[PDB]
Amino acid sequence: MIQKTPQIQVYSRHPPENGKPNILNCYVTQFHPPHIEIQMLKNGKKIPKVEMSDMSFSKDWSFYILAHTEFTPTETDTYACRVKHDSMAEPKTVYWDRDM
């Protein structure tokens, strides 16, 4: 009866440049209960070998996780983080905006 809705940021570790390898982070926070499903998408298609930090919660009790994967940003490739949580009636997909 008291869930908390995840909050998602998708952003590169290093400044984005087309053609140069980098790390793309999806950072999900502010959620409870701790169970969560997280997916990173390249052009809609699941990226395998995504690495994910272990269960942690912050000083306000809410949980968080950092997903991340290698990637080489291009003009046309879209990257996303789709997140399923019982707070939400259905998965939320957040698309990477390279200026944020």
Binding site: I2, F57, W61
Partner: protein, 266 residues
Amino acid sequence: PHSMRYFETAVSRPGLEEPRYISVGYVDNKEFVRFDSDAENPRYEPRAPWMEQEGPEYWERETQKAKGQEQWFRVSLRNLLGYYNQSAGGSHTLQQMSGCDLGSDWRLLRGYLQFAYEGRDYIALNEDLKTWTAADMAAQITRRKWEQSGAAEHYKAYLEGECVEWLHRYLKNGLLRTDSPKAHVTHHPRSEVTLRCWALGFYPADITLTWQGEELTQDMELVETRPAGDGTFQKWASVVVPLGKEQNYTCRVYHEGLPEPLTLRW
């Protein structure tokens, strides 16, 4: 200025009468031990190089205590269930924060003990380490029992005794850290033009960006501080201004790793 903390979580499952107990330990907000009841042979594991010098007996003892606490969370989840008349077979979380803050002399500044249920404040030890604060009625029944039994004397002995001592061992086995925000403003034509002040690659995470030449109230656009994943953090703060009168506002960054606040723009 230092700290030790254990963060504990138990989570109840449908059917499986036993919850999942995870326990993480931090020194200076950095992970160094972790316990997860879902491992095949559950045990505390080092999370940082400097823990691997602690010998077999350390791990045995602390693992045994992890298991004790796990049992304690079992019982307390089970009871909470009755306190709040919650249905059987649901999913429920009990969490505890505990530990101590040391000043720059390695003396105790403050001891901490808090419990939350379903991610809500349940009960907490006041900074006096003698009395308690209860969030709702359930928790006051708790409070009442504990203050009748003097449990606070137990937790006070831990926070003033072993938490400080062992933190000292840990610090010795670890003498200061910080990285400063490399920063810059970006330009983004709204329909008018957005100015995003950027702060990158800093540690620790605490930071203040603001715009200005009077303190720029709001229409502030900011993101929660986020980890680059290399050990550093990022944050930006933007403001929408129309054209040409960029060169009238100011971005300033406040970070303890800076010789002085940065004053930025273009």
